[PDB]
Amino acid sequence: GQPREPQVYTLPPSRDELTKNQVSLTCLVKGFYPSDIAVEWESNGQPENNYKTTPPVLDSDGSFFLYSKLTVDKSRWQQGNVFSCSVMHEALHNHYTQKSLSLSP
Amino acid sequence: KAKGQPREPQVYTLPPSRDELTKNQVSLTCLVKGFYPSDIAVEWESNGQPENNYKTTPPVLDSDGSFFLYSKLTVDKSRWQQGNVFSCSVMHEALHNHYTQKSLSLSP
């Protein structure tokens, strides 16, 4: 079992969820091995409060994946705040990698 | 905010991240959240027939006492780019007919 680096992808809220007062921001972390991993969410250099992460799940190729869900007030999403998903894993070159997510360009 | 009562799942489909379009296969995501109790089944289908390459996470207890999970369907990028419609089906006791289905496809 060779170590494999996680691939990190951020997903904005579904348009159907945009009708609610709170929305979900998703971080997909896939293709990693071994399963030991840490995931955090932040915004404006401060960690977020309301997020949960699934346990790692074995994928069809023998690597693992997981999802982390951050819940925020829709107003914070629409005001263009940038949210970031940070991942720590032994296979990453610097043991750390981050991806951002925002409504703004 | 009383916990412990049956709650209907909310089912949301999410397309691949733009960054994943650099790969030969992409991930189609189904977020199922706000449900209670935790017993639930999820399946993906297209062209009516079931899909092969998908995996679902176990349910996770959320901050409000309900559960959520994600299901990931992996498809060749070309199938996604051609506009094929994929559907996430969910079975749970709190849903009308104990079932709901939500589609996902590339907007033209």
The CATH number of whichever domain residue A9 belongs to comes to: 2.60.40.10
User: Do residue B20 and residue A13 have CB atoms under 8 angstroms apart?
Assistant: no
Q: In whole angstroms, give the CA distance from residue A66 to residue B71.
A: 10
Q: How many CA atoms lie within 13 A of B35 on its CB side?
A: 29
User: Do residue A10 and residue B17 have CB atoms under 8 angstroms apart?
Assistant: yes
B67: how many CB neighbours lie within 10 A of its CB? 22
Which among B43, B22, B27, B34 is positioned nearest to A66, based on CA atoms? B27
User: Do residue B17 and residue A9 have CB atoms under 8 angstroms apart?
Assistant: yes
Which token pair is A96?
Answer: 């750390």
Helices (DSSP H) in chain B: which residue ranges? 77-81
Which token pair is B13?
Answer: 């489909």
Sign of CA dihedral A14, A15, A16, A20: positive
Q: In whole angstroms, give the CA distance from residue B1 to residue B65.
A: 9
Question: For testing the chain A interface, which of B1, B17, B24, B53 should be mutated: the one with the most A CBs within 10 Å?
Answer: B17
Approach to solving: X-ray
Q: In whole angstroms, give the CA distance from residue B9 to residue A83.
A: 26
Resolution number, Å: 1.5
Nearest-by-Cβ selection for B57 from A16, A54, A99 = A54
SS3 B46: strand
Radius of gyration of chain A (CA): 14
Q: How far is CA B102 from CA A35, B45, B95, in A?
A: 30, 10, 13
Burial class (CB in 10 A: 0-12, 13-18, 19+), B80: buried
Nearest-by-Cβ selection for B31 from A24, A53, A58 = A24
B20: how many CB neighbours lie within 10 A of its CB? 18
User: Do residue A57 and residue B62 have CB atoms under 8 angstroms apart?
Assistant: no
Q: Which domain range does residue B70 map to?
A: 1-108
| Domain count within chain A | 1
